[PDB]
Design an enzyme around this catalytic site. Structure first.
Site, PDB file in Angstrom:
ATOM      1  N   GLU A 146      27.087  55.015  41.570  1.00  4.90           N
ATOM      2  CA  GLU A 146      27.231  55.131  43.019  1.00  4.90           C
ATOM      3  C   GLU A 146      26.369  54.066  43.698  1.00  4.90           C
ATOM      4  OE1 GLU A 146      29.523  56.938  44.280  1.00  4.90           O
ATOM      5  OE2 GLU A 146      29.071  56.353  46.346  1.00  4.90           O
ATOM      6  N   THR A 196      33.153  50.143  47.770  1.00  6.43           N
ATOM      7  CA  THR A 196      33.107  49.698  49.190  1.00  6.43           C
ATOM      8  C   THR A 196      33.302  48.180  49.250  1.00  6.43           C
ATOM      9  OG1 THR A 196      31.635  51.535  49.663  1.00  6.43           O
ATOM     10  CG2 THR A 196      31.757  49.817  51.339  1.00  6.43           C
ATOM     11  N   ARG A 252      54.241  51.919  35.200  1.00 10.72           N
ATOM     12  CA  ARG A 252      52.940  51.591  34.637  1.00 10.72           C
ATOM     13  C   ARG A 252      52.033  52.818  34.627  1.00 10.72           C
ATOM     14  NH1 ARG A 252      53.341  49.345  39.536  1.00 10.72           N
ATOM     15  NH2 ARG A 252      53.980  47.344  38.625  1.00 10.72           N
ATOM     16  N   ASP A 256      36.542  44.935  37.577  1.00 14.65           N
ATOM     17  CA  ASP A 256      35.620  46.055  37.698  1.00 14.65           C
ATOM     18  C   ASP A 256      35.595  46.811  36.379  1.00 14.65           C
ATOM     19  OD1 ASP A 256      33.811  47.811  38.732  1.00 14.65           O
ATOM     20  OD2 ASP A 256      35.242  48.906  39.984  1.00 14.65           O
ATOM     21  N   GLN A 275      34.274  51.714  32.219  1.00 14.84           N
ATOM     22  CA  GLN A 275      34.153  51.474  30.783  1.00 14.84           C
ATOM     23  C   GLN A 275      32.891  52.162  30.281  1.00 14.84           C
ATOM     24  OE1 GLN A 275      36.037  50.554  27.580  1.00 14.84           O
ATOM     25  NE2 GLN A 275      36.789  49.724  29.521  1.00 14.84           N
TER      26      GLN A 275
END
Ligand SMILES: C/C=C\C/C=C\C/C=C/C/C=C/CCCC(=O)O[C@H](COC(=O)CCCCCCCCCCCCC)COP(=O)(O)O[C@H]1[C@H](O)[C@@H](O)[C@H](OP(=O)(O)O)[C@@H](O)[C@H]1O
Ligand SMILES: CC(C)CCC[C@@H](C)[C@H]1CC[C@H]2[C@@H]3CC=C4C[C@@H](OC(=O)CCC(=O)O)CC[C@]4(C)[C@H]3CC[C@]12C
Ligand SMILES: CC(C)CCC[C@@H](C)[C@H]1CC[C@H]2[C@@H]3CC=C4C[C@@H](OC(=O)CCC(=O)O)CC[C@]4(C)[C@H]3CC[C@]12C
Ligand SMILES: N#Cc1ccc2[nH]cc(CCCCN3CCN(c4ccc5oc(C(N)=O)cc5c4)CC3)c2c1
Lengths: 235, 57, 286, 336
Positions: A40, A45, A59, A81, A85
């Site tokens: 976080e 954002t 997909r 991003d 993972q």
């Protein structure tokens, strides 16, 4: 050799090679950015703000790696991003060697907060350890880092209410947004061991729509120009 | 984290009940297999170029 | 005494050919060195190789024998090859400077519209300028004084041709290169200039080191170009206008004539044998 | 709780049994075997066309067609005999680190940083490759995949689990759990009833496909394991790790047999494979070299130098004619 099947096979191979070369030339015209940060830490954002005006230029949902494709000032950007993972970074961080820059996102307002794994572990200390680990890999020795400090308003309110000495006991100064922000910025910048090779661009995320993407564009252009100067031998 | 301990101990006690053979017998079997198929290994003994697909048709 | 001159010239051609051929081979056999800048450097190396294989032997023979003993048609061929290849070498230097200027000052163009077709166009334009400078003395516009003395192979000394060739082969390239590298230097300085005290001191020292390096490299390039080619063109622009009272000493004249060819030997050293990628490729090949 | 006491007691009992079953090392048995001798291999084909680093390759059962995966989002089907690109499949996600070739030669699979195993149908009515099905359900990067059959595929991911998929349905038929680290490699037995997986917890395990349970556990390495491959017999396998040490484990003896290490190598292994007869053990390293080992002697027999960046994938044809090594410099090389 002269058989019809061999001629057809060679023709198909040449066509496939031409298509591969065209696709490679098309892909080489793109600037690749790696997005990192804590859980976080305002990563989403920054992604949303960068794709507000420009997006994508049965997909199955991936959730492994997310690609954001946006263009600014006739320049093509791709952001990867890897927040979702959940595995060892050591096994796949080398796949991103060769990116133009790394967009590191850290929240200023989580210095007071602590991780859910254990109470005696500051979230900002976790972010600092991640920054140290990613800034000094054997793969990212030549890669510049773009540092985003999100949640400036929440940080200002928190330092109005709570002091900064809890996150940084060695700190000794007046509790004000300017001084505290400068201290946090210099603390993150002091972890850059490769001073001569790489440079860190620090920006404070703002509510204006285009300022952050403008800063990213300026940093990328500066990186490209400095790389060209180094190749020419003038830097 | 006590539920996983039962599964781990069950796995350990299941892994210890398999029959085991002497290492000498196993090494002898591996050596016998290696020597039995030594003639059919193109990498060990270089093949003549007449029947080598990757050099001449 | 001519043996010393012959062996010095022979080792000069040998070194030039070896260096240029090594640069061309390293570019050709390596996939890593296959971008636009290295394509321009390779074209420059090929031009220098042509200068060292097609022009330097005949010039060395002329120097050793102190007379031309090959024929009038061979003299014309030597002059044409000399003017074409050497003018090309200079305009390759200017093309490399222009490509560097475009890359440094226009990152968007560097990312989007920079393709090997640009390098091909630059090389073709360079060779076209070379042809435009070398051909017209052959198709007329040549004084009979060139063929007046069979025991000589002097370039045409017509005032109009002298002005045209000297300008379009050295002086326009000189101004173009000076302007481009001045703009590049300003851009580099702008990029460079733009406990806390220890970090500030380290940054200041690093900036000073980078400024010294960007002065040294530019000085090396421009000084090599000047000290290689300027004296010969000053001579070729001054002497034809002042026919008398401007006798040229034999030793100084020979040194001035032969200084220009050392640029074809020093070019691979500056543009190829210095950047890290070429050194790594050569180490891998070695 | 107190279960750790009986757990360590069982570990000690297993170690004691393994030590008791070990009487003579494999080196002693094969002392009288004459050396294989120097092995000299010369590059025969250089496959060009990839524009980025290559992380995987696989040979067809016909030993003529091979598939490679690279970061440019391309999955090329080569023809090693004539260096002809039969196919070029553009991937939806360019982050790919595995590929497999179906035994029937009809399908090809790939996976990577996205947690989806994609199945591509090669032989179709229009001659154009199309995505047959996408297999989702893992929560980590897909590290390896092997076609158990034309309809069943087994995959290993970075979420510390391996799964068996049913391509017709698309659901996980069986899930193999027990690893405490990211699973990096996987190899199927020749009879396709068992398979072994090497993970980042420095251990390798033997699984039963039908029962879906860990049959045995092997722990000899000191670091994460990046490669694994069954012995052609089907009763042994070899693992490569970042420790810079290849080891040979035996299923029946349930212990370690041989250690393949040298003092001049300090870089981890990225790929391991065997020859047709099992005498040669080929391994790729991070120093852009490939070393050929004597499986019964632990002595180097040759070096397959010729790559530039790092050998990341390796394979041997079913008939044993050739060895193909792909590296990060974007070149496949057929050695033979
Ligand atoms: C008084 C105050 C101040 C002044 C006093 C003193 C200080 C200065 C004096 C004057 C300078 C003289 C020469 C200095 C050269 C020097 O420092 O060279 C450096 C060291 O390299 C080697 O050692 C490698 C050398 C390899 C040589 C070539 C080998 C083969 C030769 C024969 C070839 C033909 C036969 C085969 C390398 O170069 P560099 O550090 O000078 O700086 C740059 C160079 O100028 C740029 O051109 C180059 O860009 P490029 O154009 O793409 O190549 C850059 O990458 C970079 O290398
Ligand atoms: C064909 C003949 C002339 C042989 C080739 C000689 C060149 C290699 C020489 C001639 C002029 C020299 C330059 C003259 C002066 C300088 C400035 C000098 O700068 C400094 O470091 C301090 C002085 C300053 O600030 O300019 C660095 C070396 C350099 C570029 C020299 C590099 C070597 C050059 C190009
Ligand atoms: C780039 C670095 C390697 C320096 C390059 C130096 C060259 C420009 C030198 C090397 C050998 C020199 C030549 C060696 C000997 C002679 C003979 C010499 O004989 C004369 O005609 C002088 C008068 C006479 O004695 O009659 C004239 C200069 C010349 C051509 C020299 C011209 C300049 C050369 C080509
Ligand atoms: N003008 C002009 C002009 C304009 C535009 C141009 N572009 C390109 C050029 C070519 C520049 C070099 C010309 N070469 C000829 C002169 N030189 C030479 C060599 C050996 C020698 O030997 C004797 C002897 N033995 O007497 C005399 C003699 C003289 C070597 C240099 C050019 C020229």
């Amino acid at each position: 050799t002269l058989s019809a099947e061999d001629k057809a096979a060679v023709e198909r191979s040449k066509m496939i090679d031409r298509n591969l070369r065209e696709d490679g030339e098309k892909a080489a015209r793109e600037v690749k950015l790696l997005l990192l940060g804590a859980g976080e830490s305002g990563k989403s954002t920054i992604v949303k703000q960068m794709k507000i005006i420009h997006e994508a230029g049965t997909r199955v949902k991936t959730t492994g790696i997310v690609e954001t494709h946006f263009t600014f000032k006739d320049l093509h950007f791709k952001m990867f991003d890897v927040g979702g993972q959940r595995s060892e970074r050591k096994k796949w961080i080398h796949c991103f060697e060769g990116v133009t820059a790394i967009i590191f996102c850290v929240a200023l307002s989580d210095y007071d907060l602590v991780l859910a794994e254990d109470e005696e572990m500051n979230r900002m200390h976790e972010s600092m350890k991640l920054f140290d680990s990613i800034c000094n890999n054997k793969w990212f020795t030549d890669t510049s880092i773009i540092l985003f400090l999100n949640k400036k308003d929440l940080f200002e309110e928190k330092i109005k209410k709570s002091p900064l000495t809890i996150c940084y006991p060695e700190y000794a100064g007046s509790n004000t947004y300017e001084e505290a922000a400068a201290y946090i910025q210099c603390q993150f910048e002091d972890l850059n061991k490769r001073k001569d090779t790489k440079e860190i661009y620090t920006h404070f995320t703002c509510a204006t729509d285009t300022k952050n993407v403008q800063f990213v564009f300026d940093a990328v252009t500066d990186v490209i120009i400095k790389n060209n100067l180094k190749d020419c031998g003038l830097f | 984290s006590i539920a996983q301990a039962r599964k781990l101990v069950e796995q350990l006690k299941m892994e210890a009940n398999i029959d085991r053979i002497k290492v000498s017998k196993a090494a002898a079997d591996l050596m016998a297999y290696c020597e039995a198929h030594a003639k059919e290994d193109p990498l060990l003994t270089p093949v003549p170029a007449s029947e080598n697909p990757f050099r001449e048709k | 005494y001519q043996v010393i001159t012959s062996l010095l010239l022979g080792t000069l051609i040998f070194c030039a050919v070896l260096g240029n051929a090594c640069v061309v081979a390293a570019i050709a056999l390596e996939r890593s060195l296959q971008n636009v800048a290295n394509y321009l450097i390779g074209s420059l190396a090929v031009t220098d190789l042509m200068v060292s294989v097609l022009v330097l032997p005949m010039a060395a023979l002329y120097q050793v024998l102190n007379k031309w003993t090959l024929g009038q048609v061979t003299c014309d061929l030597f002059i044409a090859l000399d003017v074409l290849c050497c003018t090309s070498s200079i305009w390759h230097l200017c093309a490399i400077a222009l490509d560097r200027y475009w890359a440094i000052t226009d990152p968007i163009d560097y990312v989007n519209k920079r393709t090997p077709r640009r390098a091909a166009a630059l090389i073709s334009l360079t060779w076209l300028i070379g042809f435009l400078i070398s051909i017209p003395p052959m198709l007329g516009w040549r004084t009979p004084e060139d063929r007046s003395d069979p025991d000589a192979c002097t370039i045409s000394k017509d005032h109009g041709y002298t002005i045209y060739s000297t300008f379009g082969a050295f002086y326009i390239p000189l101004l173009l290169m000076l302007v481009l590298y001045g703009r590049i230097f300003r851009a580099a300085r702008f990029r460079i200039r733009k406990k806390n005290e220890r970090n500030a001191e380290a940054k200041r020292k690093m900036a000073l080191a980078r400024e010294r390096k960007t002065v040294k490299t530019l000085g090396i390039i421009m000084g090599t170009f000047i000290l290689c080619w300027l004296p010969f063109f000053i001579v070729a622009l001054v002497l034809p206008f002042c026919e008398s009272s401007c006798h040229m000493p034999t030793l100084l004249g020979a040194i001035i004539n032969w200084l220009g060819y050392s640029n074809s030997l020093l070019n691979p050293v500056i543009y190829a044998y210095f950047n890290k990628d070429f050194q790594n490729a050569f180490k891998k090949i070695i | 709780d107190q279960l750790r006491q009986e757990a360590e007691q069982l570990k000690n009992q297993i170690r004691d049994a393994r030590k008791a079953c070990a009487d003579a090392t494999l080196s002693q048995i094969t002392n009288n075997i004459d050396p294989v001798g120097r092995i000299q291999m010369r590059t025969r084909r250089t496959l060009r066309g990839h524009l980025a680093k290559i992380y995987a390759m696989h040979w067809g059962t016909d030993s003529r067609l091979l598939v490679s995966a690279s970061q440019d989002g391309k999955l090329i089907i080569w023809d090693s005999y004539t260096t002809n690109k039969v196919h070029a499949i553009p991937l939806r996600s360019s982050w790919v680190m595995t590929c497999a070739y179906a035994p029937s030669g009809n399908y090809v699979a790939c996976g990577g940083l996205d947690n989806i195993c994609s199945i591509y149908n090669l032989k179709t009515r229009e001659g154009n490759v199309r995505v047959s099905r996408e297999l989702a359900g893992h929560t980590g990067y897909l590290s390896c995949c092997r076609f158990l059959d034309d309809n069943q595929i087994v995959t290993s991911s970075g979420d510390t689990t391996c799964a068996l998929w049913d391509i017709e349905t698309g659901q996980q038929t069986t899930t193999f759990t027990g690893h405490t680290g990211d699973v990096m490699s996987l190899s199927l037995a020749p009879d396709t009833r068992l398979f072994v997986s090497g993970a980042c917890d420095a251990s390798a395990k033997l699984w039963d496909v039908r029962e879906g349970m860990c049959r045995q556990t092997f722990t000899g390495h000191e670091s994460d394991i990046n490669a694994i491959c069954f012995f052609p017999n089907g009763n042994a396998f070899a693992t490569g790790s970042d420790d810079a040490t290849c080891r040979l484990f035996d299923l029946r003896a349930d212990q370690e047999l041989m250690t393949y290490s040298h003092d001049n190598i300090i870089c981890g292994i990225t790929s391991v494979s065997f020859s047709k007869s099992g005498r040669l053990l080929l391994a790729g390293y991070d120093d852009f070299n490939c070393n050929v080992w004597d499986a019964l002697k632990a002595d180097r027999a040759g070096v397959l130098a010729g790559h530039d960046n790092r050998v990341s994938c390796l394979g041997v044809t079913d008939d044993g004619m050739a060895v193909a090594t792909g590296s990060w410099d974007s070149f496949l090389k057929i050695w033979n």
